[PDB]
Design a protein around this ligand. Structure first.
Ligand code: PLP
Ligand code: CL
Ligand code: CL
Ligand code: CL
Ligand code: CL
Ligand code: CL
Ligand code: CL
Ligand code: CL
Ligand code: CS
Ligand code: CS
Lengths: 256, 395
C-alpha cells in the first residue's frame, strides 16, 4: 500500500503536521489496549507507532520498560500482538501503522517470515530499534519485498554520511531524535529522505507546533501516552478520558 | 564502515541503536591505534607485571593424574590480582578509556567478579566507576557489592526486566548512549557488539602466550589440548587465541550443564541455544520459542550468562574448537578433588574445565595426553556454596 505517502500528501494539502502517538501493544492488557488505540485514533492520531513487548528493550527509557512489564504481567505474546494488529487494520483502513521492534523478535522465526506476517496483517512500517543502518540490509530487503517501509532513526550525534544512508535506505518517514535541528531537517530534504517526524521529548502541544515550524512533517510522542496509561491503571474509564483529551490537544497543535 | 571485520563468520556484528554507533566506532579506532603504540603496550605490560603479578604460574599437577598417562598443567590465573583472569582485560580497557580522554567507567556485573575487577582497575587509574547490577544479584552477592563500594565504585541496582545480568547489561548501554563523551563502557566478557569480542580477546591473549612459552620450556612441545570454561567466553578465548594457528593443539571449551542438559536448567548454548540477536550481537542465546531472552543456570554464578561470545560460535562452526558441558555435580567433584590432591581451591567456574580434563583422563587412562586447564580463578568465594550443598546431601 502507500499509506504514509497518502497521509503526507493529504496533510500537506491541509498544511498540517502529523501527530503520531506510541503505545505498547497489550499494555495494560489486550482488551484495554484495543480500546486505548481506538481512542487514540478517534481523538485525531494521524498514524500509530506500536511496540511489541520484548524482554530486553535496550533502547527504551523507564516508562516504556514499565509498559513492557505490564504487558508481560498480562501474558501478552508477539502472536497475540499480531492478532491485535490484524484487528486494528480491519477497523481502520487508511491510518499508517508502524511497529517498533527489537531485532530478536524479527529474526526469531526468520526475517522474511516476520515481514510477511507484517504484510498479512496490514502493517506499513517497521523500525528495528537495535539495528543500525550499517547492519540493516537484510531487514530493509525483507521489508521492501513485503511492501513494508523500513524506518531509521536519525540521532542527535548524526553526521553527513549517516544522513545520506538514512535518506537512501529509509521509507515512510525518517525518525528524528533531537548541527542544529534546521540543518538536519534541511539536509534530509536535500537528500530526498522520507518526511521527518520529530520524536524527541514530544510531551506537550507546544512541542508539536515547534516541530512543524522547524520544517518536520510532524511529531511522534514516544512516551507521554504511555505515561497517561501508567497514571490511570486503576481507572480504565478515566484512562480513556485523559488519553482522548491529550491526543486531541496534541493533534490540534499540528493544524495550520 | 569499520576498520576491522565485526563478524566471525556469520556471528557477531554491531546490533545497537544508531545513537551508540559513534561510541563503538570511536572505541574501535582507539583500540587499533593503541595496538600499534609501543607506549600503550609498555604501560599495559607494566600494570600486568608490577600491579597484577604476571606472568602467572603454570603448575604441573602430579597427584591428580597418578597412575594414568595424562600429564596435566594448570595455568594459574587464580594467582592474578583479584584472583580471576578478568583483571587482565579491565586494565587494558582502563588504559583505553584514558587514551580516549574518558574519566568515568560504566560496567555491568552479575556474579560481581567483573564489577570488582572494574572497580579495582578504576581506583588504580583514577577513574570514577559506576556498576550496574540487577537487584536480584545485589541481594545474592553482598561480599562482592561491598568490595566494589570499598574500592569507591558506585553500585546501582537494576529493577527492570528480570533484575539480573541481562537487565544490568541493558542499563549500562542506556547510560553509555548518553554519557560516552566522558565515560567508557567496560564490557565484562568476549561478547557484545564489535569491537568488544576482539578487544577482550586481545587483552586476554597473554594467557595463551605465556602458556605456550611455559609448556615449551617445561615439556619441549605444544599441549595436545587446552581446556577452559566458557561463560561469555573471555578466559577461554584468552587461552585459545595464541594456539589457533597451531592446528595440532586441541581447543576445548566447557559450558555449564547445570542440573543436566535434559533438565533445561543449564548454560550450554553452543549446542542447545538457538541463534538470536541480542546484547549487540548475533550469537546463540537462551530464549523462549517466541524469542524472549531467558535466564541461564549454573551452580557457578560466573558461568550464568545467557549467550556466548561470537568467536566461540565461529570456532565451533568451522570445527577448530570443540565444546562440551559439565554438570553442577561434576564441577563439585572436581572442586573437591583439586582441594584435596593439589591444595588449590579452584573457582567453581574453573572447576568445570578441570572436571572435563579429569573425564578425558579417567575415560581413557592409558591414552598419552598433555593437557592444560586454564584455572581462570580461585574458589575462596565458593566455600559457603560448596558447604551448603555438602551438608544438605548429608556429607
Ligand atoms: C568471569 C569468570 C568466568 C566466566 O567468564 P568468561 O568471560 O567466560 O571467562 C570464569 N571463571 C572465572 C574465575 C571468572 O571470574
Ligand atoms: Cl485489558
Ligand atoms: Cl500494508
Ligand atoms: Cl558484606
Ligand atoms: Cl556523552
Ligand atoms: Cl628447558
Ligand atoms: Cl535443552
Ligand atoms: Cl538449537
Ligand atoms: Cs601421570
Ligand atoms: Cs555459555
Amino acid at each position: 500500500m502507500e499509506r504514509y505517502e497518502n497521509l503526507f500528501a493529504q496533510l500537506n494539502d491541509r498544511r498540517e503536521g502529523a501527530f503520531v502517538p506510541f503505545v505498547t501493544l497489550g499494555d495494560p492488557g489486550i482488551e484495554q489496549s484495543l480500546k486505548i488505540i481506538d481512542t487514540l485514533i478517534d481523538a485525531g492520531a494521524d498514524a500509530l507507532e506500536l511496540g511489541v513487548p520484548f524482554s530486553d528493550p535496550l533502547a527504551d527509557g523507564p516508562t516504556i520498560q514499565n509498559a513492557n512489564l505490564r504487558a508481560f504481567a498480562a501474558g501478552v505474546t508477539p502472536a497475540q500482538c499480531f492478532e491485535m494488529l490484524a484487528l486494528i487494520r480491519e477497523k481502520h483502513p487508511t491510518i499508517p501503522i508502524g511497529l517498533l521492534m527489537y531485532a530478536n523478535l524479527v529474526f526469531n522465526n526468520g526475517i522474511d517470515a516476520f515481514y510477511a506476517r507484517c504484510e498479512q496483517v496490514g502493517v506499513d512500517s517497521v523500525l528495528v530499534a537495535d539495528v543500525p543502518v550499517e547492519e540493516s540490509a537484510p531487514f530493509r530487503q525483507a521489508a521492501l519485498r513485503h511492501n513494508i517501509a523500513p524506518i531509521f532513526i536519525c540521532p542527535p550525534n548524526a553526521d553527513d554520511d549517516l544522513l545520506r544512508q538514512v535518506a537512501s535506505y529509509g521509507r515512510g518517514y525518517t525518525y528524528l531524535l533531537s548541527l542544529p535541528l534546521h540543518h538536519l531537517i534541511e539536509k534530509l530534504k536535500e537528500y530526498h529522505a522520507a518526511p521527518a517526524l520529530q520524536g524527541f521529548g514530544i510531551s506537550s502541544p507546544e512541542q508539536v507546533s515547534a516541530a512543524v515550524r522547524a520544517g518536520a512533517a510532524g511529531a511522534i510522542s514516544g512516551s507521554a501516552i504511555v505515561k497517561i496509561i501508567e497514571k490511570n491503571l486503576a481507572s480504565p474509564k478515566q484512562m480513556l478520558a485523559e488519553l482522548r483529551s491529550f491526543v486531541s490537544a496534541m493533534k490540534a497543535a499540528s493544524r495550520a | 564502515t569499520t576498520l576491522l571485520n565485526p563478524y566471525f563468520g556469520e556471528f557477531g556484528g554491531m546490533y545497537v541503536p544508531q545513537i551508540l554507533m559513534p561510541a563503538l566506532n570511536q572505541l574501535e579506532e582507539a583500540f587499533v591505534s593503541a595496538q600499534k603504540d609501543p607506549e600503550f603496550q609498555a604501560q599495559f605490560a607494566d600494570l600486568l607485571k608490577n600491579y597484577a603479578g604476571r606472568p602467572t604460574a603454570l603448575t604441573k599437577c602430579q597427584n591428580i593424574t597418578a597412575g594414568t598417562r595424562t600429564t596435566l598443567y594448570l595455568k594459574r590465573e587464580d594467582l592474578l590480582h583479584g584472583g580471576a583472569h578478568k583483571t587482565n582485560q579491565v586494565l587494558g580497557q582502563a588504559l583505553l578509556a584514558k587514551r580516549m580522554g574518558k574519566s568515568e567507567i560504566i560496567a555491568e556485573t552479575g556474579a560481581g567478579a567483573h564489577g570488582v575487577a572494574s572497580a579495582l582497575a578504576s581506583a588504580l587509574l583514577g577513574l570514577k566507576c559506576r556498576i550496574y547490577m540487577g537487584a536480584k544479584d545485589v541481594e545474592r552477592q553482598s561480599p562482592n557489592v561491598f568490595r566494589m563500594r570499598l574500592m569507591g565504585a558506585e553500585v546501582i541496582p537494576v529493577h527492570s526486566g528480570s533484575a539480573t545480568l541481562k537487565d544490568a547489561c541493558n542499563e549500562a548501554l542506556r547510560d553509555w548512549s548518553g554519557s560516552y563523551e566522558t565515560a567508557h563502557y567496560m564490557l565484562g566478557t568476549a561478547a557484545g557488539p564489535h569491537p568488544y569480542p576482539t578487544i577482550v580477546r586481545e587483552f586476554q591473549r597473554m594467557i595463551g602466550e605465556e602458556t605456550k612459552a611455559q609448556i615449551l620450556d617445561k615439556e619441549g612441545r605444544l599441549p595436545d589440548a587446552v581446556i577452559a570454561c566458557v561463560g561469555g567466553g573471555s578466559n577461554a578465548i584468552g587461552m585459545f587465541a595464541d594456539f589457533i594457528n597451531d592446528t595440532s593443539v586441541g581447543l576445548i571449551g566447557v559450558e555449564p550443564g547445570g542440573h543436566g542438559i535434559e533438565t533445561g536448567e543449564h548454560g550450554a548454548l553452543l549446542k542447545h541455544g538457538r541463534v538470536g540477536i541480542y546484547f549487540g550481537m548475533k550469537a546463540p542465546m537462551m530464549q523462549t520459542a517466541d524469542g524472549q531472552i531467558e535466564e541461564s543456570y549454573s551452580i557457578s554464578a560466573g558461568l550464568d550468562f545467557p549467550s556466548v561470545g561470537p568467536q566461540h560460535a565461529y570456532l565451533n562452526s568451522i570445527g577448530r574448537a570443540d565444546y562440551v558441558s559439565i554438570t553442577d555435580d561434576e564441577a563439585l567433584e572436581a572442586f573437591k578433588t583439586l582441594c584435596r590432591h593439589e591444595g588449590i581451591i579452584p573457582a567453581l567456574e574453573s572447576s568445570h574445565a578441570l572436571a572435563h580434563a579429569l573425564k578425558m583422563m579417567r575415560e581413557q587412562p592409558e591414552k598419552e595426553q598433555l593437557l592444560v586447564v586454564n584455572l581462570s580463578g580461585r574458589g575462596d568465594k565458593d566455600i559457603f556454596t560448596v558447604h551448603d550443598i555438602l551438608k544438605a546431601r548429608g556429607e
